[PDB]
Design a protein around this ligand. Structure first.
Ligand code: CU
Ligand code: NA
Length: 621
């Protein structure tokens, strides 16, 4: 029984039973997060202990708890009451998404704002938005959501077309109180609709697309065993799923001859945040931590064959817990397939007369999630040649506002009266490395330009410089695209046949990092997003760059606190945290539903193998 298997329905029910028997899950309790924990280092042999961690909210105002249970042993390992003003509020609950609109609908100040604008309260949707930490002292220790209004002209209307600017409200979702209603002035509510299935807006659908059929007549080249263990074209790994992170990859390894060589022990997107750059007080507080506050795995879509996932698809249907501890399956939530990837290697040699061509392929593991207006696909790719890549596909409907009279330095115009505030989508990939095993180190590699002179008389030479990051105090790094900066993770105790350390090189896209002022709340709460690359010493409790309880947690925790331990990372069990994001100045083409745009990173073997690992690929049939 692989200790990396997906949680089963019965395991979640067992958690529920253990919590109930221990007095921790009475009728006032709600599970805000539940997930299996990874096996401890060295546990492999033997005796598994499947532990689950749970964040338990209390709707009656009692303090929430963080609990770890052993489903194997039927026990509570630890249970701690949380002081949310200190360590953060629990993630937003799916049940709280309707509460903001419902509380506002009977509030006299909200009704007064809507009546001034001649808006029928029954048609006003309220986006349930994370609050962050600003100047409102009454919010400390309370579970707050903020609400922005959007008009639905009819039940199938896209409300995003009709933002109600100049108005925001704040709500206490436990006491069921509206704390503040701020109305700074009326703005026209944009009139056009954004209904991308309405023939009046789409026009006649094109009839020019002829079918494309992708099939595998002998089925796929990968196998799935033990529920979630993949073997494909020398790669071995396990596909996990966590309600916060989504798809997680474990034990990524490559079979090089007769040895199973580890590469990455755990790969995940450990945080993703959407900071907004509109200084209007209506939105200047808006920073949506899709992963840490909302939990991206929870909202994973069920992916339909042909439409969402094309080709010969193998699905996983991961199980999560509902708010009461009952298991719920996400049907078809994870898509797995292999696909052709063009030319792998080709050479036509005049002298030998040999013409050689081989094709590449990649294995794809993906899920797609929806967070309000946003929809994101998360894709991991494994290539025949050893490259590993992650790509995010961002789509959905842009978050809208009014477009001010006279224009805006911080908002794009989409349609008459309709704006879209500038924002970024910034990800953190947590890569618990295991290059040839756990003894690893990181070097920053820059290209080196050389001056024409002695030893370089024609002025053509160039070189490279590698700097070992020896301790966490030295391991907070920025991009330098101009100098071709990359980061190499190597195993200083494992040499290839040329007597050089085996490694993998991280190639970033070098997109802008967090733009907010360094003194802002978001720069403190999302400090990870201010730098491209961080290296920490592995510690089982250091899971997220933002810490455990992101919602309404005041800055500081996460990676800057972890790094302060100044641990040795020079030939040790280490974790690379790569920040990468999209800076989005919305364009007209993004309206009324946005075409996908992408961001990501890749790692390529760098002296990991003794020669090309794809010499045994056969000629295409
Ligand atoms: Cu965007
Ligand atoms: Na590691």
């Amino acid at each position: 029984a692989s200790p990396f298997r997906l949680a089963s329905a019965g395991e979640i029910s067992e958690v529920q039973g253990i919590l109930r028997t221990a007095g921790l899950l009475g009728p006032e309790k709600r599970i805000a997060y539940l997930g299996v924990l990874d096996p401890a280092r060295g546990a492999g042999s033997e005796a598994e202990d499947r532990r689950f961690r749970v964040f338990i909210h209390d709707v009656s105002g009692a303090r929430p708890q963080e609990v770890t249970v052993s489903v194997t042993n039927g026990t509570v390992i630890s249970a701690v009451e949380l002081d949310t003003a200190a360590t953060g509020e629990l993630p937003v609950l799916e049940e709280e998404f309707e509460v903001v609109e419902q509380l506002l609908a009977t509030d006299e100040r909200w009704l007064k704002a809507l009546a001034a604008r001649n808006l029928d309260v029954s048609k006003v949707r309220v986006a349930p938005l994370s609050a962050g930490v600003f100047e409102y002292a009454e919010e400390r220790g309370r579970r707050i959501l903020r609400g922005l209004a959007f008009v639905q002209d009819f039940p199938e209307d896209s409300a995003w077309a009709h933002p109600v600017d100049g108005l925001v409200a704040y709500v206490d979702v436990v006491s069921k109180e509206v704390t503040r209603v701020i109305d700074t002035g009326v703005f026209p509510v944009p009139a056009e609709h954004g209904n991308y299935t309405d023939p009046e807006l789409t026009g006649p659908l094109r009839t020019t697309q002829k079918p494309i059929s992708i099939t595998q007549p002998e089925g796929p080249s990968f196998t799935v065993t033990g529920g979630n263990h993949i073997e494909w074209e020398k790669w071995s790994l396990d596909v996990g799923f966590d309600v916060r992170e989504g798809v997680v990859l474990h034990n990524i390894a490559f079979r090089d001859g007769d040895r199973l060589r580890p590469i990455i022990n755990r790969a995940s997107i450990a945080e993703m945040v959407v900071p907004y750059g509109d200084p209007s007080p209506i939105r200047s507080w808006q920073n949506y931590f899709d992963t840490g506050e909302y939990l991206v795995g929870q909202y994973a879509n069920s992916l339909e064959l042909g439409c969402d996932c094309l080709g010969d698809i193998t699905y996983l249907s991961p199980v999560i817990s509902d708010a009461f501890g009952n298991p719920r399956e996400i049907r078809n939530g994870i898509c797995m397939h292999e696909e052709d990837w063009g030319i792998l290697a080709k050479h036509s040699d005049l002298w030998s007369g040999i013409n050689y061509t081989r094709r590449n392929r990649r294995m794809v593991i993906s899920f797609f999630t929806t967070i309000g207006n946003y929809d994101y696909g998360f894709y991991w790719y494994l290539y025949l040649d050893g490259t590993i890549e992650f790509e995010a596909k961002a789509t959905g409907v842009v978050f809208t506002s009014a477009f001010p009279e006279g224009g805006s330095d911080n908002i794009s115009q989409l349609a008459p009266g309709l704006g879209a505030p500038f924002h970024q989508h910034i990800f953190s990939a947590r890569l618990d490395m295991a290059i040839d095993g756990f003894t690893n180190r990181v070097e920053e590699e820059d290209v080196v330009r050389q001056t024409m002179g002695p030893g370089n008389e024609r002025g053509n030479a160039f070189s490279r410089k590698r700097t070992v990051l020896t301790r966490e105090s030295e391991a907070v790094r920025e991009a330098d695209a101009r100098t071709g900066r990359t980061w190499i993770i190597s195993n200083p105790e494992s040499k290839n046949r040329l007597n050089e350390p085996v490694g993998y090189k991280l190639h970033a896209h070098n997109q802008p990092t967090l733009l907010a002022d360094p003194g802002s709340s978001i720069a403190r709460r999302a400090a990870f997003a201010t730098k491209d690359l961080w290296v920490t010493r592995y510690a089982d409790d250091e899971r997220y760059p933002t810490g455990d309880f992101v919602n309404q947690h005041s800055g500081g925790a996460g990676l800057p606190s972890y790094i302060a331990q100044d641990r040795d990372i020079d030939g040790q069990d280490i974790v690379v945290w790569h920040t990468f994001g999209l800076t989005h100045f919305p364009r007209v083409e993004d309206w009324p539903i946005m075409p996908v745009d992408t961001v990501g990173f890749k790692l390529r073997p760098e002296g990991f193998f003794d020669r090309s690992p794809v010499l045994d690929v056969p000629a295409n049939p």
